[PDB]
A paper describes a structure:
In our current work we have identified the outer membrane receptor responsible for ferredoxin and pectocin import in Pectobacterium spp., which we designate FusA. The discovery of FusA demonstrates that, like their mammalian pathogenic counterparts, phytopathogenic bacteria can use a TBDR to specifically target iron-containing host proteins.
We solved the crystal structures of Arabidopsis ferredoxin isoform 2 and potato (Solanum tuberosum) ferredoxin isoform 1 (CAC38395) (Ferpot) and performed docking with extracellular portion of the FusA structure using the programme HADDOCK22. Docking solutions formed two major clusters in which the ferredoxins docked with the extracellular pocket of FusA, with the C terminus either pointing up and away from the FusA barrel or at right angles to it. The C-terminal up solution was favoured for both ferredoxins. To investigate this we tested purified leaf ferredoxins from potato isoform 1, maize (Zea mays) isoform 1 (ACG46956) and Arabidopsis isoform 2, which share 70–75% sequence identity, for their ability to enhance the growth of a panel of Pectobacterium isolates. Maize ferredoxin only enhanced one strain weakly, demonstrating that the discrete amino-acid sequence differences between the ferredoxins have a large effect on the ability of FusA to utilize the protein as a substrate.
Numbering used by the authors: 2 to 99
Write the structure that this text describes.
Amino acid sequence: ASYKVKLITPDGPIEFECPDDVYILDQAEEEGHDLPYSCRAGSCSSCAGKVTAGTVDQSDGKFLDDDQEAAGFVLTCVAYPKCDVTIETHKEEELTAL
Ligand code: FES
């Protein structure tokens, strides 16, 4: 019901606990962290990250195709944690370089 989220940013790790019914980006902001975003609606690539451990539910978002979702990309503005999760943030360049 609350999961440990570790975010691997360009200048290192940050973790917090995040309820299973709160989006990861929302919770990160309640915790004082500043992450990239634009639409907050699952329809651009601005908030993109990559899951390196655990799983998320991001079915509220529509931007990613199945090859991107398969490579672990995630839209942090519309993603709920489903277990303890590790997510490397600021992945817009890499996603949009696929
Ligand atoms: S800010 Fe656009 S998909 Fe997250």
